[PDB]
């Protein structure tokens, strides 16, 4: 078995094999990288996602999130206060604020530290689910709004046609900005990369783990657990490392800089911070080993998660037991 102790594995395609993605996908699964439930792609050095950045500034985020923290430093809950329209220049200024901006630090590790320590005592302003992309139309390798569909894989796959679309979503970060633990919709994969700017870290459970982790979500958040079923599928809860080696759960940590991609795998929950102000990509995807986790996929029907139009689908097709509750949730 390739990969035994789920690590998290870096890939150096060269600029041949970033031709075929589909093709590269299945190699690095070949060598156990989905274990991990996250891989980190370093693009060749001939490629480029654009030119450049220097004409981003009049993006809208039409809603910027303030993401306000409930509980302890190591275990708490973030809620999203909506905030008034500004543009990505009004935004990446008010990340280099005095307010907003990364204290100093040594290292990624020093930086780490500060987060854990300190996160709760701010409400740090995040641009995220923003439909749209930045790559140049002319990239032609690992361009995330050219990538086959999920509708499509789904057809191909199990010959059944349907409706829905798959486009890519951009989040502007800032010092201290989170993203809670999660799988993605219907634990398909994700793949993620940092156009510019400040670093992203992350942490993730191995997938054939994931169920110790929900064990402790629900010990941990314990009314939201009484609330439902699949409470992490609400993308509010933070768990600290230190929390997660108290309580022997399996998992592992790496930081992302600008110009690299990472992927996350079927069931690999996910969480992370940001660095300072950046700007990253991100769309789902599937493949055939997907369909099965699909499948299994636990759901929100309390009405919190709310999600795409094009997930409906997806349940309604791979889940149809479980549909007309899932739909009453979504109405
Ligand atoms: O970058 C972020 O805030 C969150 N991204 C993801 O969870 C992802 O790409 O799957
Ligand atoms: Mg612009
Ligand atoms: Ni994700
Ligand atoms: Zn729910």
């Known amino acids: 078995a390739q990969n035994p102790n789920c690590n998290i594995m870096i890939f150096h395609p060269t600029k041949e094999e970033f031709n075929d993605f589909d093709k590269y996908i299945a190699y690095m699964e ?49 809620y999203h206060k909506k905030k008034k329209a500004m543009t ?39 641009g995220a689910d923003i ?63 940092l156009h510019l700017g400040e670093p992203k870290t992350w942490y993730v459970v191995p997938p054939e783990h994931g169920q110790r982790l929900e064990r402790l979500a629900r010990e941990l958040f314990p009314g939201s657990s009484r609330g439902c079923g699949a409470f992490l599928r609400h993308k509010v809860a933070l768990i600290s490392p230190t929390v997660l080696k108290e309580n022997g759960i399996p998992f592992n940590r790496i930081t992302q800089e600008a110009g690299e991609f990472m992927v996350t795998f079927p069931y690999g929950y996910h969480a992370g911070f940001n660095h300072g102000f950046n700007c990253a990509e991100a769309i789902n995807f599937a493949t055939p080993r997907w369909i099965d986790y699909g499948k299994m996929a636990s759901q929100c029907s309390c009405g919190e998660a709310r999600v795409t139009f094009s997930m409906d689908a997806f349940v309604r097709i791979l889940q149809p037991e479980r549909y007309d509750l899932w739909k009453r949730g979504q109405d």
């Open 131 to 193: 439909s749209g992309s930045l790559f140049d139309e002319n990239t032609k390798q690992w361009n995330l709004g050219h990538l086959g569909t999920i509708q499509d894989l789904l057809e191909k796959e199990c010959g059944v046609v349907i409706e829905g679309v798959n486009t890519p979503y951009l989040y502007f970060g800032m010092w201290k900005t989170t993203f809670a633990w999660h799988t993605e919709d219907m634990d398909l994969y994700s793949i993620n990369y």
């Open 88 to 126: 990505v220049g009004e935004y990446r200024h008010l990340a280099n604020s005095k307010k907003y901006q990364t204290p100093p630090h040594q290292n990624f590790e020093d930086l780490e530290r500060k987060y854990w320590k300190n996160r709760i005592y701010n409400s740090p302003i995040y």
């Open 30 to 78: 070949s060598q156990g990288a989905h274990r991990a439930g996250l891989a980190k792609i370093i693009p060749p050095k001939e490629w480029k996602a654009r030119e450049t950045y220097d004409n981003i500034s009049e993006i809208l985020i039409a809603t910027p999130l303030q993401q306000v923290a409930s509980g302890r430093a190591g275990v708490f809950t973030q």
